[PDB]
Design a protein around this ligand. Structure first.
Ligand SMILES: [Cl-]
Lengths: 47, 48
């Protein structure tokens, strides 16, 4: 399934998706997106 | 370790107390499950 983990490297509030995604790519995930409410950066990968 | 989270595929209704979410999540072959703190979703957890 699609598994998520908060990014270990992304700092600040998650406004834009692209920075979050880039952080998540750098830590071997497939994507990254901002979370629903708290605007955390979630990295996603098939699991 | 690197905990990964995925919303339960079988848990229905809102998630308040851990045990039923944890049961469904183990039943989906995850390691554990817990209620999310804002949206009260049942999130399954496994090492990823
Ligand atoms: Cl249930």
């Amino acid at each position: 399934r699609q598994c998520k983990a908060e990014s270990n490297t992304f700092t600040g509030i998650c406004i834009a998706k692209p920075p979050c995604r880039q952080a998540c790519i750098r830590e071997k995930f497939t994507d990254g997106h901002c979370s629903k409410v708290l605007r955390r950066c979630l990295c996603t990968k098939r699991c």
